[PDB]
C-alpha cells in the first residue's frame, strides 16, 4: 500500500518572535489612580530623560501635556505625543504670538514644569477658573502663577522648588535639562527620606 505517510514536522516552528502590550494611558488624575512618591518620582525621571532626548536632537515639542504622555505596563512612560489627543496647556509667549513662533526650548521646559505641577497636585492647573473667556485673559497678561498649596503630602520637598522655579516666566533663568537630570537624581536619592 501507499499508506498515509505521517511525515508531520512541516512548519511546527516557534514563530512567536512578536510582541503585544500597552497599559492604558496617563490621564489617571481624572481616572483618580492616586499613587505614591516612588511612582511619581520614577515617572518624572523617565519623562525627563525622554524629553531631554528630543531636546538634544533639537526637536521641539511645545504642545506636550497629559494627553500627549503615554504610560505602559512595563512601568515606562512613552512621552511620544499621540498627535491629536488643547487649551490651558500653553504659555503666554504662545498666546501673545509676538513672533508667531513661540516654539523654543524654554517653552518646552515650562510645559514640562506645569505638567509636573498637574501630576504632583493630582488636579488640572487653574481648576477654580473654567471659562475660556477669562482664562485667555490671564495667560495673555502672563503675570500670575499657580499656587503650590495643593501639594501631595509626604514627598521630598526638592521637587517643590523644582516646579516653583520651572513655572516662573523668566525664560533666561528657567532651569535646563543638564541640571534637570541632577535634580531628578537627587530626587531619587531623597526617595527613602
Amino acid at each position: 500500500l501507499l499508506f498515509m505517510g505521517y511525515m508531520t514536522k512541516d512548519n511546527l516552528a516557534v514563530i512567536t518572535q512578536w510582541c503585544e502590550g500597552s497599559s492604558l494611558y496617563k490621564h489617571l488624575h481624572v481616572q483618580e489612580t492616586k499613587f505614591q512618591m516612588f511612582q511619581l518620582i520614577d515617572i518624572a525621571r523617565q519623562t525627563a530623560q525622554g524629553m531631554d532626548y528630543l531636546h538634544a536632537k533639537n526637536i521641539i515639542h511645545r504642545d506636550m501635556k497629559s494627553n500627549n504622555i503615554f504610560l505602559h505596563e512595563g512601568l515606562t512612560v512613552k512621552i511620544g505625543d499621540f498627535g491629536l489627543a488643547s487649551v490651558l496647556w500653553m504659555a503666554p509667549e504662545v498666546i501673545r504670538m509676538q513672533d508667531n513662533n513661540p516654539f523654543s526650548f524654554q517653552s518646552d521646559v515650562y510645559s514640562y514644569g506645569i505638567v509636573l505641577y498637574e501630576l504632583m497636585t493630582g488636579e488640572l492647573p487653574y481648576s477654580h477658573i473654567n471659562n475660556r473667556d477669562q482664562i485667555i485673559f490671564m495667560v495673555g497678561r502672563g503675570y500670575a502663577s499657580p499656587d503650590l498649596s495643593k501639594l501631595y503630602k509626604n514627598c521630598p520637598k526638592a521637587m517643590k522648588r523644582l516646579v516653583a522655579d520651572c513655572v516662573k516666566k523668566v525664560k533666561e533663568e528657567r532651569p535646563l535639562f543638564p541640571q534637570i537630570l541632577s535634580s531628578i537624581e537627587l530626587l531619587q536619592h531623597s526617595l527613602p527620606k
Binding site: M4, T8, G50, I59, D81, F82, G83
Partner: protein, 273 residues
C-alpha cells in the same frame, strides 16, 4: 578613495536610532516634519536670495545707465558727484548680497543629506505578469514525450541515484541538480526497478528500491503542502534524520510492501514471457 560626501545623512524613519521611552511611531513624525520644514526654510532662503540678486543687479544696471546719462549731459556735474556716492553704496549692497549668496552655498554644503535630496526619481515602469496557469496530468502527449526526453538525456543521474544509499549525500547531490525532482522521475524509477527485479537482481533491486521509495513520500508531502516537490525535497532528509520511531517503521513497511509488489509484478512478467 574618498567618502567625504556620504558622511552626513538624515533618515527620518531610522529604526535603529530611537529611545526606549519615546514612541517610535510618533518619533518618526517629528523627524520627518522637521526635515520638511528645514527644507522649506532653505528653499525660501534660496528664492528670496535669488530675487535679491536680480533686483540689486537691475539697481546697479540702471545706476550705471544714469551715471552715463549724467556724464553725457552738461551741468549735472554735482548730480554726477552725488551719484558717485550713491553708486558706491549700490556696489556695497551688491557685493554684500553676493557674500550672502556664498554663505548660503557654504550652508548648503554643510546641509546633511536626506531621502529627497540624495536622489531624484528616474523612471519607473510596473509590469504585471498575466500568463496562463494550471497544469495537466496524462499518460500521453507532452507528458509521455517529457518522460522519454528526460530518461534519454539524464539516464546517468537517475541511475547513480538508483545506486545510492546515503541520505545526506542524496540531498546534496540532488540540490546540485534539482531538475531530477519530478513525477516522471518517480515513475521511471518504479518501472525500471520492476525491470531490475525482472532481471532477478535482489540486492540491486533493494538498493534501487530504497532510493525509489525515497521520493514517493516527497511527492506525497509536496501534494500535501501544495508546493512543487522541487521546493520541499531538501527538508525531507532533515525530517527523516529527526524522524520518530513510527515514521521509521512506516518507511520500512512501505519499503517492504513496495518490494513485495515489485517481486510479484516481476514474477507475473516472467510467467507471461
Amino acid at each position: 578613495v574618498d567618502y567625504s560626501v556620504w558622511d552626513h545623512i538624515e533618515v527620518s524613519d531610522d529604526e535603529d536610532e530611537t529611545h526606549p521611552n519615546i514612541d517610535t511611531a510618533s518619533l518618526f513624525r517629528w523627524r520627518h516634519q522637521a526635515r520638511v520644514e528645514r527644507m522649506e526654510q532653505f528653499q525660501k532662503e534660496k528664492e528670496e536670495l535669488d530675487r535679491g540678486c536680480r533686483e540689486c543687479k537691475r539697481k546697479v544696471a540702471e545706476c550705471q545707465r544714469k551715471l552715463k546719462e549724467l556724464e553725457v549731459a552738461e551741468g549735472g556735474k554735482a548730480e554726477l558727484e552725488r551719484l558717485q556716492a550713491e553708486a558706491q553704496q549700490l556696489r556695497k549692497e551688491e557685493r554684500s548680497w553676493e557674500q550672502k549668496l556664498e554663505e548660503m552655498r557654504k550652508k548648503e554644503k554643510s546641509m546633511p543629506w536626506n531621502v529627497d535630496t540624495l536622489s531624484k526619481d528616474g523612471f519607473s515602469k510596473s509590469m504585471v505578469n498575466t500568463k496562463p496557469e494550471k497544469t495537466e496530468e496524462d499518460s500521453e502527449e507532452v507528458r509521455e514525450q517529457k518522460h522519454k526526453t528526460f530518461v534519454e538525456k539524464y539516464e546517468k543521474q537517475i541511475k547513480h541515484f538508483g545506486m545510492l544509499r546515503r541520505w545526506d549525500d542524496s540531498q546534496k547531490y540532488l540540490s546540485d541538480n534539482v531538475h531530477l525532482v519530478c513525477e516522471e522521475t518517480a515513475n521511471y524509477l518504479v518501472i525500471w526497478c520492476i525491470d531490475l527485479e525482472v532481471e532477478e537482481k535482489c540486492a540491486l533491486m533493494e538498493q534501487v528500491a530504497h532510493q525509489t521509495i525515497v521520493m514517493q513520500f516527497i511527492l506525497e508531502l509536496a501534494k500535501s503542502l501544495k508546493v512543487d516537490p522541487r521546493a520541499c525535497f531538501r527538508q525531507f532528509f532533515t525530517k527523516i534524520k529527526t524522524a520518530d520511531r513510527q515514521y521509521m517503521e512506516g518507511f520500512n513497511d512501505e519499503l517492504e510492501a513496495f518490494k513485495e509488489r515489485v517481486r510479484g509484478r516481476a514474477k507475473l512478467r516472467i510467467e507471461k514471457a
